Structure 1
């Protein structure tokens, strides 16, 4: 089997991407944030505290003839931005782009933090990291990809995120028309439950490539590119007027600037992030100070190849017995 679904930016900055997901019988379609940095599929629901729902589409398990309460199961998660959610769990039929999994754990939110309430466009998350990170207790549950894997033509999914444009998540096959050149594969460590890999280095603009190992995670659920302070300083030093602002919470730059590209290494191959991709717009409405898309990871504990990086590539998440990651230009 295979599946193929279009993923669409939630706003003009590509802050996140949503992909329609069919849950239950008859189908209830919710727009979920596909997140390769977490492993829970959770949704706004009929059980979510009323004051915490503001425009989202909800899953109502009582209206699904295939929903079953997973007795005694609860979940609670927090993300890198400090947001969180928690609730109970149902199993139900879940389909993505024509690919159907029965008995998928659908985690129903009883509580969500303010950042979720405040974002009307995201109805929940669909985790695509390794199932070892799944938060369901007392019986940990498998991700949608893990449940689908054995049925897929090939045990892979691909992320093809657009810049200010829709893109595609495919399951079970590699669309050879979707990228240029070849896909370079690189080793993955699953020890932390993430798609963790080691970039071979970087360049800033037309500058020389610096060979240096940068461990990090491929994370579709993080907007920006978070890298070591040395690397990030080297990037922003090429932008007149750019500075790290403690009050804003990262590097900012004059909105009048033309940003240089940033290249990262994947083995001997190179992925080029165009400078425009690194512009996240005014820090507040009407400001001439713009927020940078490359930021320091120093306060996080891990480097994160978020959407800014991933959307410059066609990315293969290879879930074979020994997982690997593939990157191609496009």
Structure 2
């Protein structure tokens, strides 16, 4: 089997991407944030505290003929940005892009934190990291990918995120029309439950490439690129007037700037992030200070190749017995 679904940026900044997902019988379509940095499929639901719902579409298990309570199971998750959610669990049929899984754990939120409530465009998350991170207790559950993988033509999914445009998540196949050149594959460690890999270095603009190992995760659920402070300082030093601001929460720069590109290594291959991708616009409406898309990972405890990096590439998440990541230009 295969599946193919379009993923759409939630706003003009590409802050996140939503992908329609069919849950239940008859189908209930919810727009979920596919997150390769977590392992829970959770939804706004008929159980979610009413004051914590503001515009989301909800899953109502009582209206699905295939829903069953997973008796005694609960979940609770905290993300890197301080957001959180928790609740109980149903099993139901879940389809993405024509690929169907029966018996998928659908984590129904009873509580969500304020950021979730305030984002009317995201109806929940679909985790695509390794199932070792799934938070369901007392019986840990599998991701949608882990449950599908019995069935896929090839044990893979691909992320093809757009810059200010829709893109695609495919399951079970490589679309050889979706990228240019060749895919460069690189080793993955599953020891922390993430798609963790080691970049071979970086360059700033038209500068020389610095060969250096940068461990980090491929995380579609994180907006920005978080790298070591040395790397990030070297980038922003090439932008007139760029500074790290304590009060704003990171590096800012004059909106009148033209930003340099940023290159990262994947083995002997290179992925170039255009400067434009690193612009996250005014820090507040009407400001001439703009927020940078490359930020320090110091204090976060891991480097994160988030959407700023991933949307410059066609990315293969290879879930074979020995997992690997692949990157191609596009």
Band the TM-score falls in, shorter-chain normalisation: over 0.9
- The whole-number CA distance in structure 2 between the counterparts of 1:22 and 1:43 is 12
1:51 offset after TM fit, Å? 0.1
Residue-by-residue CA offset, 1:229-251 (whole Å, 9 max, x unaligned) = 00000000000000000000000
Which structure 2 residues correspond to residues 292-307 of structure 1 after superposition, within 5 A? 292-307=292-307
TM superposition shift of 1:128:
0.1
The 3-state SS of whatever aligns with 2:198 is strand
Aligned-residue Cα RMSD (Å) equals: 0.2
1:62, CA displacement in angstroms? 0.1
Cα distance between partner residues in 1 of 2:312 and 2:174 = 17
**Counterpart-to-counterpart distance in 2, 1:59 and 1:283:** 34
Deviations for 1:42-92, whole angstroms, at most 9, x for unmatched residues? 000000000000000000000000000000000000001000000000000
Measure the CA separation in 2 of the matches of 1:94 and 1:211: 43
Structure 1 length normalisation: TM-score? 1.00
Q: Distance in 1 between matches of 2:327 and 2:286?
A: 37
Q: Secondary structure of 1:150's partner?
A: coil
Could you list the per-position Cα deviations for residues 276-328 of structure 1 after superposition, in whole angstroms to 9, with x for gaps in the alignment?
A: 00000000000000000000000100000000000000000000000000000
Secondary structure of 2:150's partner? helix
Report the CA distance between 1:198 and its aligned residue: 0.0
Residue correspondences, number: 330
Unaligned runs of 5+ in 2: none
Unaligned runs of 5+ in 1: none
User: In 2, distance between residues paired with 1:69 and 1:288?
Assistant: 51
Match of 1:175 in 2: 175
TM-score (norm 2): 1.00
In the TM superposition, what is the alpha-carbon distance from 1:150 to its structure 2 partner? Answer: 1.5
Q: Determine the C-alpha separation between the residues in 1 that align with 2:166 and 2:122.
A: 16
Which structure 2 residues correspond to residues 182-193 of structure 1 after superposition, within 5 A? Answer: 182-193=182-193
Q: Secondary structure in 1 aligned to 2:149?
A: helix
> C-alpha deviations, 1:11-55, integer Å up to 9, x for none?
000000000000000000000000000000000000000000000
Secondary structure of the residue that 1:94 maps to in structure 2? strand
